[PDB]
């Protein structure tokens, strides 16, 4: 592992640790649930998008009191929305962390400012998802977020139903890999620099950076992972990233549909999208 590669990983590790609050100690002041036309049939589609998401929410007291929220079954209502204000706040908090993480990196700062904007807007959901994964518990089916936890409902349905939604499948599949922190952080870097992403002038510079990180990820696994099992692993991770980009597109469509009948989005989210 070249001294430059080792250095690159060191920088990424520093950024995550400053960048990322695993505790969610500082996440505060979030909103909580309960606290004829046509268009419609837009609504039926929108209901489908909501349906995939749906989670229980748990809050743990400083007391050690626990509050549990169980989401309504669909109705018409506009019941479906109820989480959405809370979710936006969480995403907004996550996004602020994502932006810092990019900011820390020397290579990112070097980039022309317009390029930064394009990359961050493209990146941001994917990076946010990657950070979430580290929290995620496959056995629990929970994301544990400091005091906050979110737990998947069982449609029963099934796993077979559950796996139908790409995002849920991705988290379970990504979790399986049992990545090291270095591996997760590298993925963010590879995701964070994509040449593809819309609005990017400086394709050549980004592609080299993305490639350079990718090699570092490839190198790290061979050195640090005991090889014979793991020969595949880099290929799978790259596959996961490709899946993520597609999922990111799906999410973007979903938000627009949800907003248009319903608007939840925070100013940062609108700015980011």
């Amino acid at each position: 592992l070249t001294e430059e590669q080792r250095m690159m990983i060191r920088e990424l590790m520093d950024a995550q640790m400053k960048t990322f609050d695993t505790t969610f100690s500082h996440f505060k002041n979030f909103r909580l649930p309960g606290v004829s036309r046509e268009e419609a049939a837009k609504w039926s589609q929108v209901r489908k998008d909501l349906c995939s998401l749906k989670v229980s929410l748990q809050l743990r007291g400083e007391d050690g009191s626990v509050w549990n929220y169980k989401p309504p079954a669909d109705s018409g209502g506009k019941e479906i929305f109820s989480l959405l204000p809370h979710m936006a706040d969480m995403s907004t908090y996550m996004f602020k962390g994502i932006i810092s993480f990019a900011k820390v990196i020397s290579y990112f700062r070097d980039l022309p400012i317009e390029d930064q904007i394009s990359l961050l807007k493209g990146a941001a959901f994917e990076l946010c998802q990657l950070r979430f994964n580290t929290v995620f518990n496959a056995e629990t089916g929970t994301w544990e977020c400091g005091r906050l936890s979110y737990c998947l409902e069982d449609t029963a349905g099934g796993f077979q139903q559950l796996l139908l939604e790409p995002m849920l499948k991705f988290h379970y599949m990504l979790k399986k890999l049992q990545l090291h922190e270095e591996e997760y952080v590298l993925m963010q870097a590879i995701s964070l620099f994509s040449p593809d992403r819309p609005g990017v002038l400086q394709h050549r510079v980004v592609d080299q950076l993305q490639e350079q990180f990718a090699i570092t990820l490839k190198s790290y696994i061979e050195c640090n992972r005991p090889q014979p099992a793991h020969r595949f692993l880099f290929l799978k991770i790259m596959a996961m990233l490709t899946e993520l980009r597609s999922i990111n597109a799906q999410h973007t469509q979903r938000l627009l549909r949800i907003q248009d009948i319903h608007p939840f989005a925070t100013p940062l989210m609108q700015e980011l999208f």
């Binding site: 400053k18 907004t92 602020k96 932006i99 810092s100 900011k103 820390v104 700062r109 400012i113 930064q116 904007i117 961050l120 925070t266 100013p267 940062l268 700015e271 980011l272």
Partner: protein, 90 residues
């Protein structure tokens, strides 16, 4: 300087100059509160690139206080301070 480009009695459009101390800054927090308050303050955040903000739902005839905070990726800096503030009336 912080400027209001446009107003309506409900609603505000506001601008600030870019610093200076960017990169520095991950985001700008923005707080608007009723100018000395019964009111709880409201804060929302925008990307470091953004020079412009929208504030909405305001009462007519009310004098207001608007604060912008610029937020720094850990150990920039450019130190630190100031928040920059204005008051405007419906």
């Amino acid at each position: 300087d912080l400027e209001v480009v446009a107003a309506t009695p409900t609603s505000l459009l506001i601008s600030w100059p870019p610093p200076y101390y960017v990169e520095g800054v991950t985001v700008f927090r923005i707080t608007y509160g009723e100018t000395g308050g019964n009111s709880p303050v409201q804060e929302f955040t925008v990307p470091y690139w953004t020079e412009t903000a929208t504030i909405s739902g305001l009462k007519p005839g009310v004098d207001y206080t608007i604060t912008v905070y610029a937020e720094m990726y850990p150990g920039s800096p450019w130190m630190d301070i100031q928040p920059i503030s204005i008051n405007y009336r419906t």
